[PDB]
Design a protein around this ligand. Structure first.
Ligand code: HEM
Ligand SMILES: COc1cccc2c1C(=O)c1c(O)c3c(c(O)c1C2=O)C[C@@](O)([C@@H](C)O)C[C@@H]3O[C@H]1C[C@H](N)[C@H](O)[C@H](C)O1
Length: 407
């Protein structure tokens, strides 16, 4: 049926900043829907057309249900996001239908952008502390500040933890713990001492239960309880565990790119607000951290751009590819903020759209304000052309490193 390209779509060599993997162009040229090799055995189909993928993502026949995935995938493609049956109703990514509408109704007031905005200053603070520290340390050592390990993940982590009421002192270690928690909770084997974080997560929940203070975590607790009749501490810890993982790991991947672009000098020195939000917009087009959508499966057989897809056909949208489509974007592998503001799929589409878009963009804009207002001379300590980025399977794209002189 479909044009077939016999490769892992997740394959990814060491990459330079300007290029995207060639698999992407292969798929596109082969057609709107392309059979490829899934990492964990068996076929998979990849969409390459913006318009098509958008319909697919609002099409109830394409579902998250991890139980439709191939048996060979279970306990071997940690790219498969498979909570145990009884937590799936608390996992946004693993449901559709009313279970999903419910979770969405639960998260939406918690992510109220009025209330995100009210904490701009707190977020600037976080950025600045981190940046000062890395600067102060760079002056001491004489070595450049490595912004990936140093900032890109610690910044969004602290932000998202703070909004939930989760007091973190060691961002490096909270990251390791929350990563493990995530792994276990999305189906994975078997000592990152998660108990530490768990303790703090449980504290936020506890705090949320007893205090009418409208935290993010309290709003969650209120909506869950009304929707579910009754919610448990372990349930609320579980959900927020997921917000922390997503809130830091995807964002941080992105921010490393955004930084590299800012520090390379590609944003004009006197950029208005709007010029900045244009630069961010473009970096989100040009450096999506998530290559393809999350695993979706055909719930029946379906025929989609003239191709006929079996029951349980593993389907992906190509985010990286669609965003770098010569056809819909003039000079797609060039970085042009002033581009005629067009659509992208970096945050996805349809009922499962990223609920963090606002936050991630807020974080992005604010970070650039801190940098140009307090670190005006911050510059790459190596050439942009020598930077390199990579991803191993289902992991977000990220730079190997980002050496910087912050002042
Ligand atoms: C640059 C940053 C981010 C990017 C690029 C990103 C990307 C995406 C994408 C593509 C989806 C949809 C997945 C699919 O349908 O296959 C998604 C969903 C989601 N995002 Fe993000 N995300 C980002 C930041 C954040 C942040 C900061 C948070 C939370 C604090 C967050 C939380 C979520 C959650 C909970 C979902 C699940 C949606 C659902 O299943 O209804 N994200 N994101
Ligand atoms: C215990 O964990 C959870 C409990 C309740 C809800 C969730 C989770 C969870 O871990 C969880 C995630 O990890 C992720 C998302 C997400 O929304 C949840 C939950 O909704 C959304 C994101 O995919 C992006 C796109 O924002 C980030 C992340 O998905 C992970 C694993 C996935 N294979 C892929 O590598 C992606 C880059 O990263």
């Amino acid at each position: 049926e479909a044009p077939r390209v016999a490769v892992d779509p997740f394959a990814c060599p060491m990459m330079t900043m300007q290029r995207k993997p060639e698999v992407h162009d292969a798929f596109r040229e082969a057609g709107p829907v392309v059979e490829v090799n899934a990492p964990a055995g068996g076929p998979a189909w990849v969409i390459t057309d913006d318009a098509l993928a958008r319909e697919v993502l609002a099409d109830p026949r394409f579902v998250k249900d991890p139980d439709l995935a191939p048996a060979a995938w279970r306990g071997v493609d940690d790219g498969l996001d498979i909570p145990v049956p009884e937590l799936r109703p608390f996992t946004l990514i693993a449901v559709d239908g009313e279970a999903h509408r419910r979770l969405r109704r639960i998260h939406a007031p918690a992510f109220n952008p009025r209330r995100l905005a009210e904490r701009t200053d707190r977020i600037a603070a976080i950025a600045g502390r981190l940046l000062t520290e890395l600067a102060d340390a760079s002056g001491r050592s004489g070595k450049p500040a490595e912004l990936i390990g140093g900032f890109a993940y610690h910044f969004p982590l602290l932000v998202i933890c703070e909004l939930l009421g989760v007091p973190v002192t060691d961002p490096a270690m909270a990251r390791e713990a929350v990563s493990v928690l995530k792994a276990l909770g999305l189906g994975g084997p078997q000592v990152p001492d998660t108990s530490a974080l768990e303790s703090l997560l449980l504290e936020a929940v506890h705090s949320a239960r007893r205090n009418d203070t409208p935290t993010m975590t309290r709003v969650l607790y209120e909506r869950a309880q009304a929707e579910f009749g009754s919610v448990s501490d372990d349930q609320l810890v579980y959900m927020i565990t997921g917000l922390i993982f997503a809130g830091h790991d995807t964002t941080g991947s992105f921010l490393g790119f955004l930084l590299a672009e800012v520090l390379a000098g590609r944003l004009a020195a006197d950029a208005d607000e709007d010029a900045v939000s244009r630069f961010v917009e473009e970096a989100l087009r040009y450096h999506p951290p998530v290559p393809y959508t999350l695993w979706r499966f055909a719930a029946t057989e379906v025929t989609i751009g003239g191709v006929r897809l079996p029951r349980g056909a593993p389907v992906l949208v190509d985010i990286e590819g669609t965003n770098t489509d010569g056809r819909h974007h003039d000079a797609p592998h060039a970085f042009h903020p002033d581009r005629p503001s067009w659509r992208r799929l970096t945050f996805g589409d349809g009922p499962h759209y990223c609920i963090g878009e606002q936050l991630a963009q807020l974080e992005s804009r604010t970070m650039i304000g801190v940098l140009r207002s307090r670190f005006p001379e911050a510059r790459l300590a190596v050439p942009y052309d020598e930077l390199r980025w990579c991803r191993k399977g289902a992991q977000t794209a990220r730079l190997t490193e980002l050496p910087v002189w912050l002042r």
